[PDB]
Design a protein around this ligand. Structure first.
Ligand SMILES: Nc1ncnc2c1ncn2[C@@H]1O[C@H](COP(=O)(O)OP(=O)(O)OP(O)(O)=S)[C@@H](O)[C@H]1O
Ligand SMILES: [Mg+2]
Lengths: 96, 48
């Protein structure tokens, strides 16, 4: 990991590593890489909290392969939970 | 900077602030003085 990090163009390779079956959506893949790696949360003096993870909204027409990007992130990420609004046989978004 | 200002005393920590709010609400309940009523009545008449 340290050997592959010292490459100058490492980040772009990660951008090229996001969803190989998906072609041409480089900025979407960049957003995926940023969300997968994420920032750092912080809490200054305990009083004020700053969130430390990137929320990405993929708004697109049908046939832009957003669902395949979601499936790729579900495969790649450590604790990835898939849910949907219209569907039924899935974990809900509401506590109960 | 906030830790320094807490050490000087210009800012109060959140738990001390919590317990102080609890203490002030449990102990004190002020009344308006008679000389503090004419100013308030006059200012409320002028606004309306
Ligand atoms: N840029 C792309 N590269 C590769 N395959 C693509 C691309 N765009 C669309 N597809 C394919 O087209 C189909 C679209 O499937 P979906 O991922 O369900 O599309 P979608 O973006 O989710 O749109 P919906 O279903 O209306 S929300 C899949 O078979 C994809 O593999
Ligand atoms: Mg879809």
């Amino acid at each position: 990991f340290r050997k592959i990090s010292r490459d100058r163009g490492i980040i772009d390779k990660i951008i090229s590593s996001m969803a190989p079956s998906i072609y041409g959506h480089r900025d979407i893949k960049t957003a995926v890489a940023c969300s997968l790696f994420g920032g750092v949360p912080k809490n200054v003096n305990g009083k004020h909290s700053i969130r430390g993870d990137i929320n990405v909204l993929l708004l697109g027409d049908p046939g832009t392969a957003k669902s395949q990007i979601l499936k790729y992130v579900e495969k790649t990420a450590h604790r990835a939970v898939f849910a949907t609004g219209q569907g039924a046989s899935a974990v809900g978004l509401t506590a109960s | 900077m906030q830790n320094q200002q807490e050490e000087n005393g210009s800012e109060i920590s959140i738990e001390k602030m919590k317990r102080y709010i609890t203490y002030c609400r449990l102990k004190c309940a002020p009344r308006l003085s008679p000389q503090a009523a004419e100013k308030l009545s006059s200012n409320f008449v002028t606004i309306r």
